[PDB]
Amino acid sequence: GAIQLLKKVILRSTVCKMDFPKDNLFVVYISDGAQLPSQKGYASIVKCSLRQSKKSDSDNKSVGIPSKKIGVFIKCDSQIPENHIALSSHLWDAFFTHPMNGAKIKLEFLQMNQANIISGRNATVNIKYFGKDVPTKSGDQYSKLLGGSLLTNNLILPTEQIIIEIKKGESEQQLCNLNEISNESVQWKVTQMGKEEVKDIIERHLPKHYHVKETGEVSRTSKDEDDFITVNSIKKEMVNYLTSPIIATPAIILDGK
Amino acid sequence: IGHTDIPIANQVFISRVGGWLQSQKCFQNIILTTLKKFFSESKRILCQNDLIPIAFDSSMADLNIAEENDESDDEDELGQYYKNDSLVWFFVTSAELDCFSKDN
Amino acid sequence: ILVPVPSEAQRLRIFQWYLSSHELNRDVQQKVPVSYMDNISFSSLSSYSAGLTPLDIKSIVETARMTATARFYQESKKCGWLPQSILITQEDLSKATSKARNEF
């Protein structure tokens, strides 16, 4: 009964910032050089465990694996380099990571033949906002902010600090599309879950080091895009030499007084 | 002999072949993982007293990417993400089976 | 036992080794292959190779590969008629020798 799975492939993360039309929320960009059988799929980072010192690790033993498989739309691009992938910022936040090139994303498409998809009736989205300030963010407001979304059970957006387990009454669901559904048939619920289960959820899924808040970690600490135009006579060369396919020796030294 | 007629073993004792590579404590785990994968890829054919070489990318040593990447689909894009650099050998010392044949 | 700086024939053999195709195609991920024109006077290079070491020979051959690749890509951009491989000229190796003597 599960959705039949088309070709699955890995791809190199790219921070090359594209348009990423704001209309949709979870979409990506792939090179047009290859054929894309489907526009809908799942993406999943591949965690690289570097902290295996002192033997012990963070594998399935006493530590579960967060939801790597996250549904996202797919669409080609001619400018993006071949064998490369660009992710919407919302995707980066969903994966609990900042934009970063070179990350290897496992991905796999689907097909458009399925009735389990909620064909209209009762698309009860569980917007389980667990933040503070008792914000008046309405279900209608979130809808306006969440339209054009392919939701799936147990996924979190830390930017809004919102956890969602899409529900159809008491029947769950993993997929949905704005285009194929009527906006009336989606129901938005605004509440705050018990702080105990929220604490447990963050302890089990949100790592203690990750804090998506861009302003929380001040990076725009007076970093104006200063241009030292004459000295660019060197910069323009360096990048080329650095971007040159072949480097005679791996190193280049920049020297100054 | 036809591939059908080749008996299937149950327990196989393999003595790791002594080698400078096999010694490094920092490597052993990646080596045994490489063996587990290589046998997991598909069926294999072996003989008593034989030897098995493995080629692996030592650069992945401390990069202990978790096993939960079950049967990584694009092991080819991973292999090009890798580059097997160092080689090891393994000795098959015994195989357990209860289907006796002329060519055990 | 002392290992001397390579002599003329030693440098000749060093070149025979490095300029052998497969050695140049080690880390060539790009599809286009790499190779050299056959009009290269190896003896002249060996003679001009006075007072060098094999690692310097590696440096100079890689630098020649560089000038060749840069020129080839520039030509492909320029004319739009892409050739089917890469080539290295006596001039390129001569300038690499000059650069090597300089940095030495």
Swiss-Prot record, chain A:
Domain of life from the UniProt record: Eukaryota
Induction trigger: By oleate.
Localization per Swiss-Prot or TrEMBL: Cytoplasm, Cytosol; Peroxisome membrane
Other remarks on this protein: Present with 2100 molecules/cell in log phase SD medium.
Subunit structure comment from the entry: Interacts with PEX6; forming the PEX1-PEX6 AAA ATPase complex, which is composed of a heterohexamer formed by a trimer of PEX1-PEX6 dimers. The PEX1-PEX6 heterooligomers associate with the peroxisomal importomer via interaction of PEX6 with the peroxisomal membrane anchor PEX15.
Family statement: Belongs to the AAA ATPase family.
Domain statement: AAA-cassette D1 is required for interaction with PEX6. ATP-binding in AAA-cassette D2 is required for interaction with PEX6. ATP-binding and hydrolysis in AAA-cassette D2 is required for proper function in PEX5 dislocation.
Role description: Component of the PEX1-PEX6 AAA ATPase complex, a protein dislocase complex that mediates the ATP-dependent extraction of the PEX5 receptor from peroxisomal membranes, an essential step for PEX5 recycling. Specifically recognizes PEX5 monoubiquitinated at 'Cys-6', and pulls it out of the peroxisome lumen through the PEX2-PEX10-PEX12 retrotranslocation channel. Extraction by the PEX1-PEX6 AAA ATPase complex is accompanied by unfolding of the TPR repeats and release of bound cargo from PEX5.
Protein name: Peroxisomal ATPase PEX1
Gene: PEX1
Curated annotation (Swiss-Prot), chain B:
Protein name: Peroxisomal ATPase PEX6
Subcellular location: Cytoplasm, Cytosol; Peroxisome membrane
Family named by the database record: Belongs to the AAA ATPase family.
Role played: Component of the PEX1-PEX6 AAA ATPase complex, a protein dislocase complex that mediates the ATP-dependent extraction of the PEX5 receptor from peroxisomal membranes, an essential step for PEX5 recycling. Specifically recognizes PEX5 monoubiquitinated at 'Cys-6', and pulls it out of the peroxisome lumen through the PEX2-PEX10-PEX12 retrotranslocation channel. Extraction by the PEX1-PEX6 AAA ATPase complex is accompanied by unfolding of the TPR repeats and release of bound cargo from PEX5.
Shown residues within the full chain: 301 to 404 of 1030
Disulfide bonds, paired cysteine numbers: none
Additional note from the record: Present with 1630 molecules/cell in log phase SD medium.
Description of its domains: AAA-cassette D1 is required for interaction with PEX1. ATP-binding in AAA-cassette D1 is required for attachment to PEX15. ATP-binding and hydrolysis in AAA-cassette D2 is required for release from PEX15 and proper function in PEX5 dislocation.
Signal sequence, renumbered to the chain: none
Source organism of the structure: Saccharomyces cerevisiae (strain ATCC 204508 / S288c)
Subunit structure: Interacts with PEX1; forming the PEX1-PEX6 AAA ATPase complex, which is composed of a heterohexamer formed by a trimer of PEX1-PEX6 dimers. Interacts with PEX15; anchors PEX1-PEX6 heterooligomers to the peroxisomal membrane and mediates their association with the peroxisomal importomer. Interacts with UBP15.
UniProtKB/Swiss-Prot annotation, chain C:
Lineage: superkingdom: Eukaryota
TM annotation in the entry: none
Subcellular location: Cytoplasm, Cytosol; Peroxisome membrane
Quaternary state and interactors: Interacts with PEX1; forming the PEX1-PEX6 AAA ATPase complex, which is composed of a heterohexamer formed by a trimer of PEX1-PEX6 dimers. Interacts with PEX15; anchors PEX1-PEX6 heterooligomers to the peroxisomal membrane and mediates their association with the peroxisomal importomer. Interacts with UBP15.
Domain topic, free-text comment: AAA-cassette D1 is required for interaction with PEX1. ATP-binding in AAA-cassette D1 is required for attachment to PEX15. ATP-binding and hydrolysis in AAA-cassette D2 is required for release from PEX15 and proper function in PEX5 dislocation.
Miscellaneous information on this protein: Present with 1630 molecules/cell in log phase SD medium.
Family membership noted in the UniProt record: Belongs to the AAA ATPase family.
Function: Component of the PEX1-PEX6 AAA ATPase complex, a protein dislocase complex that mediates the ATP-dependent extraction of the PEX5 receptor from peroxisomal membranes, an essential step for PEX5 recycling. Specifically recognizes PEX5 monoubiquitinated at 'Cys-6', and pulls it out of the peroxisome lumen through the PEX2-PEX10-PEX12 retrotranslocation channel. Extraction by the PEX1-PEX6 AAA ATPase complex is accompanied by unfolding of the TPR repeats and release of bound cargo from PEX5.
Protein name per the record: Peroxisomal ATPase PEX6
Organism: Saccharomyces cerevisiae (strain ATCC 204508 / S288c)
Classification of source organism: Eukaryota, Fungi, Dikarya, Ascomycota, Saccharomycotina
Stretch of the intact protein here: 614 to 717 of 1030
